[PDB]
Design a protein around this ligand. Structure first.
Ligand SMILES: [Cl-]
Ligand SMILES: [Cl-]
Ligand SMILES: [Mn+2]
Ligand SMILES: [Mn+2]
Ligand SMILES: [Mn+2]
Ligand SMILES: [Mn+2]
Ligand SMILES: [Mn+2]
Ligand SMILES: [Mn+2]
Ligand SMILES: [Mn+2]
Ligand SMILES: [Mn+2]
Lengths: 97, 92, 78, 105, 104, 92, 96, 79
DNA sequence: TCAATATCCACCTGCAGATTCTACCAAAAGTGTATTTGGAAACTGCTCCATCAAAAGGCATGTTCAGCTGAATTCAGCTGAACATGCCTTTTGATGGAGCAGTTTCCAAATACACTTTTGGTAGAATCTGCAGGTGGATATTGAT
DNA sequence: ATCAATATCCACCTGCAGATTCTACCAAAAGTGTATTTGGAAACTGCTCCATCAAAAGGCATGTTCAGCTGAATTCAGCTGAACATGCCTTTTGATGGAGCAGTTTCCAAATACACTTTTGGTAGAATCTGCAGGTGGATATTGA
């Protein structure tokens, strides 16, 4: 009987998804989120499917290179785990909030 | 000859703080501001018209550009004043 | 629906970022950042939408919304 | 003979705004309310920076606004700060700000 | 006959000249400007396809997909600087794990 | 009724890699890219002329813009390619 | 004999220079540098005095919010001293 | 060789305006090099604008345009 | 320090979905002629830049000395990873209808031109006048104990 | 939480360099009237886009266990801050000569506007191929011991 040492599988998943290109959030919840947010700015709005597509590509990209930066802050504090104060600094030093 | 926003800026100063003045270096900073905000607003209204295959920049483009380029509350006030001025101006 | 952005989906995103270990507090944090981002992009896109007197948000509206935030996107027009 | 600016109730020059728009390569034709609307907005934002700078100039017990005051006025205003976030005011300095950690016990 | 033929180019000198004239860039457009700009667009386009085609064949495919474009841009010191603020849809990221996170 | 850079890109593809093809999603990206760089070079050359009280965008504005907008080695080559093309065009 | 505890004077200098607006690098050394850098790019070149003026306001303005960012990275690693790996991280997340 | 003209104590003042309380000895050579790179990019663009205008003198406006190009808009030299 | 499970990497295959490759018709692109016009050439009053002399005080440099910082070591609780069952929410595919874009047509109102007057905004002069330095009394700061 | 020795703050002073006025032209708005566009109201036609519905099915939520990582904690060699004294160089300033600006004309070369005449590039079909994705054969990765 044999089982992955913590950290091993995560490294195998890093290699797995840096290698791949598909959208990583489930499409329907995401779509639901877009429409909700939109309905607050204005009701009765409609979306080309490619508009939600475009919103998702952009969103997953922005979240991915934020984790790249968050990770760098986590390393800088001689840790291996990302933590909320890591994403807060990362965001802080890119002017974005 | 070198035109500038100096006199117009000065008048607005006397409107908000009548007994207050302004150094020339500070005046150039304000001058810079107006050119900067102008080019921001104009250019974005340029791009708006261009996307809508329209060849005219109208005040409706200026307003929408202000709604994009200005942070929430700043824009609300600006938009009221922008509106208030063309409707006053059409009646004259 | 923000809760529909699930824990393991966020984990995959982070793995694409080379993140190896993740605090449990990252997920509600991440949700909050995604929400702010969408709120700013969609608001600018809709503002482009209503300007054209339309009721339908096109891909180009979003593409323009992203260029405004300094996030040029390729593959839906420009 | 009335100024285009007076009909609008404005202090900024609508005719100049209109000229800079036309000679500025922004679009082929320029609407009649466009420079009126723009000048009003330019004038509003100028009012807003000058009011808050004037306040900072009196807090400094000066009666003439200098660039330091404009800097203190922008950076201390949440929204003006966002608007001019990529902008350097020469001879303006920075806001007084020490990170709590660096303070004594 | 085509202006594009007279210039030694594959991009359309004529379209460029129109897009410049109708683009609200200036009242007048010089005659060599659209040739020059078309040539630059061709050059940059040539260089990306050169590197994308290569990146597809290193992967033993013979059709360029967005991944190949992404890998080509991000692996190029200078192209990457040029398109540093650009997201390529369906491109993924470069394979890159921080050394500190490896075992040993 | 709806123009694009797709055919010209394909032609250029066939020069560098005659046996290689390109998916449609990849072509929309190449397209996006071509429009992007155009507006960049066009916009900067627009600004150049306006800063100089000039009303013609010439090949010299284009070249100066490329020198601003492109990274070093990349710019060197494009300036070479752009010149090489305009000088050829004069001899015809 | 009476003397400042390390850091006390340091805190007093931060307060002092956040209060002022004067250029903090010496003008003539700076000028000498600009022209040196400029001459490698192109020879026989001249500068308006404000051209060098603008170059310096800009330069300092940039270095100052770079130290601000460098300082934040330093706090983030629970130190108080800024160090090269602080300026390196800061620059990396600023596009640079 | 003028880069040594940015002195250690001058850099400190800048750090003090940046809110720095304590400073490593490796920061100064590090700070100088960063400064030299910044100027090299600004000056080159500024010079490109200068030579385009067929001038032999770098104006203040060249620098302001060069800076606006790097996303660093600057106020007080417009007029 | 080596061996057994598993896993991924290698190479191979026949086709549906995508990509190529073809076959007409507007709408751009190209031409021909007739004008404009922007901006290069050649010259020129004048800034504005470059040096220079050099005294003179302000800042930098280098050494000493002390306290406190960051780097290094150890260690326990507890967080977050790995895994499996099970159920649900998503995905997927076809369908239907209604609300929109998008296509053209066609005039009113809006904008651009082209000239003729009417001022306002600018550029130097000619005036005022806040603020820079300098100084004397208070109040804060800081280490010492 | 009391103290003496310092540093800093706040206001006043006066002479001036820079800010505000004040004048006297001149481009540039404003004014009128004529010549064009344009964007928009209508009417019309498809296209998408919203909304169902109903399967499998793949992926999320939950629950269990434990490795190892993060946070708490102790000590120290030397790193850096603070102070001093010594000395170098930056700053200041007033004057000059000329280089290199702008400013003014002058005038073709180059670019725009129309009006006709080809050619191309875009679209909808007609005719093609590359991977995908199984199957399962030599290596790679992993952890147990
Ligand atoms: Cl530590
Ligand atoms: Cl004390
Ligand atoms: Mn999800
Ligand atoms: Mn030309
Ligand atoms: Mn219908
Ligand atoms: Mn004083
Ligand atoms: Mn006395
Ligand atoms: Mn005293
Ligand atoms: Mn004085
Ligand atoms: Mn179980």
């Amino acid at each position: 009987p044999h089982r992955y040492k913590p950290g091993t599988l995560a490294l195998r998943e890093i290699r797995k998804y840096q290698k791949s290109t598909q959208l990583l959030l489930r499409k329907l919840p995401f779509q639901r989120l877009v429409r909700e947010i939109a309905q607050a700015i204005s009701p009765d709005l409609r979306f080309q499917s490619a508009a939600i597509g475009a919103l998702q590509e952009a969103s997953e990209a922005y979240l991915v290179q934020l984790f790249e930066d968050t990770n760098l802050c986590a390393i800088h504090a001689r840790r291996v785990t990302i933590m909320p104060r890591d994403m807060q600094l990362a965001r802080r030093l890119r002017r974005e909030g | 000859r070198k035109e500038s926003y100096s006199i117009y800026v000065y008048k607005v100063l006397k409107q908000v703080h009548p007994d207050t003045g302004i150094s020339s270096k500070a005046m150039g900073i304000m001058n810079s501001f107006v050119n900067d905000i102008f080019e921001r607003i104009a250019g974005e209204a340029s791009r708006l018209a261009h996307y809508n295959k329209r060849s005219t920049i109208t005040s409706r483009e200026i307003q929408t550009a202000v709604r994009l380029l200005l942070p929430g509350e700043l824009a609300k006030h600006a938009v009221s004043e922008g509106t208030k001025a063309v409707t006053k101006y059409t009646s004259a | 629906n923000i809760q529909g952005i699930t824990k393991p989906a966020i984990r995959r995103l982070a793995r694409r970022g080379g993140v190896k270990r993740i605090s449990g507090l990252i997920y509600e944090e991440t949700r909050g950042v995604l929400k702010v981002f969408l709120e700013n992009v969609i608001r600018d896109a809709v503002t482009y939408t209503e300007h054209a007197k339309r009721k339908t948000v096109t891909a180009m509206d979003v593409v323009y919304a992203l260029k405004r935030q300094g996030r040029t996107l390729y593959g839906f027009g420009g | 003979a009335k100024t285009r600016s007076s009909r609008a109730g404005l202090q900024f020059p609508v005719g100049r705004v209109h000229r800079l728009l036309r000679k500025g390569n922004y679009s082929e034709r320029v609407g009649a309310g466009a420079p009126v609307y723009l000048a009003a907005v330019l004038e509003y934002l100028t009012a807003e920076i000058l009011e808050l700078a004037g306040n900072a100039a009196r807090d400094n017990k000066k009666t003439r606004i200098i660039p330091r005051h404009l800097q203190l006025a922008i950076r201390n205003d949440e929204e003006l700060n966002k608007l001019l976030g990529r902008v350097t005011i020469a001879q303006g300095g920075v806001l007084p700000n020490i990170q709590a950690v660096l303070l004594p016990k």
